[PDB]
Design an enzyme around this catalytic site. Structure first.
Site, PDB file in Angstrom:
ATOM      1  N   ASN A 122       1.020  -1.245   0.127  1.00 37.14           N
ATOM      2  CA  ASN A 122       0.046   0.052   0.081  1.00 37.14           C
ATOM      3  C   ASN A 122       1.015   1.210  -0.113  1.00 37.14           C
ATOM      4  O   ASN A 122       2.133   1.208   0.997  1.00 37.14           O
ATOM      5  CB  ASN A 122      -0.840   0.064   1.337  1.00 37.14           C
ATOM      6  CG  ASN A 122      -1.552  -1.497   1.372  1.00 37.14           C
ATOM      7  OD1 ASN A 122      -1.305  -2.047   2.386  1.00 37.14           O
ATOM      8  ND2 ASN A 122      -2.280  -1.752   0.636  1.00 37.14           N
ATOM      9  N   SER A 168       3.580   0.817   3.812  1.00 38.19           N
ATOM     10  CA  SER A 168       3.379  -0.498   4.458  1.00 38.19           C
ATOM     11  C   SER A 168       2.940  -1.592   3.354  1.00 38.19           C
ATOM     12  O   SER A 168       2.304  -1.516   2.344  1.00 38.19           O
ATOM     13  CB  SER A 168       2.303  -0.474   5.552  1.00 38.19           C
ATOM     14  OG  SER A 168       0.809   0.043   4.957  1.00 38.19           O
TER      15      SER A 168
END
Ligand SMILES: [Cl-]
Ligand SMILES: [Cl-]
Ligand SMILES: [Cl-]
Ligand SMILES: [Cl-]
Ligand SMILES: [Cl-]
Ligand SMILES: [Cl-]
Ligand SMILES: [Cl-]
Ligand code: NA
EC number: 3.2.1.17
Length: 129
Positions: A46, A50
């Site tokens: 993402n 992360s």
């Protein structure tokens, strides 16, 4: 390792997912299909930095160390790679935790959108359990 709905359901059952948080065993198997597609080496980056790991796309902001998510935590004390393992004891042992946390299974977005309020039991229809 690519799991099969049945094999996964049962996998989940012996690992205390069966009805954990009162989320019937079916739910997780549905949660699984769409997070990973019953799949262990499934990942996602993402753009926040992360990465999501495991059969349940557990996100490295809060739940795992991975060493490359500036300013995060590791509740569940594992390297995110543990989550890619075919032995799912972790994806579960942390999944247990995430779900326990407060929002219920809603943390899992795909579960929120794609599993919530639907024919769930179907995901184990006629498995041997
Ligand atoms: Cl399936
Ligand atoms: Cl169910
Ligand atoms: Cl990190
Ligand atoms: Cl990286
Ligand atoms: Cl902490
Ligand atoms: Cl760790
Ligand atoms: Cl809940
Ligand atoms: Na981390």
């Amino acid at each position: 390792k690519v799991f099969g709905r049945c094999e996964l359901a049962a996998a989940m059952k012996r690992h205390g997912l069966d009805n954990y948080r009162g989320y019937s065993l079916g739910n997780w198997v549905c949660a699984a299909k769409f997070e990973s597609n019953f799949n262990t080496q499934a990942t996602n980056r993402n753009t926040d930095g992360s990465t999501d790991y495991g059969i349940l796309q557990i996100n490295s902001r809060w739940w795992c160390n991975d060493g490359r998510t500036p300013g995060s935590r590791n509740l569940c004390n594992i390297p995110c790679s543990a989550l890619l393992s075919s032995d799912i004891t972790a994806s579960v042992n942390c999944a247990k935790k995430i779900v326990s946390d407060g929002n219920g299974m809603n943390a899992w977005v795909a579960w929120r959108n794609r599993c919530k309020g639907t024919d769930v039991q179907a995901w184990i229809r006629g498995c041997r359990l």
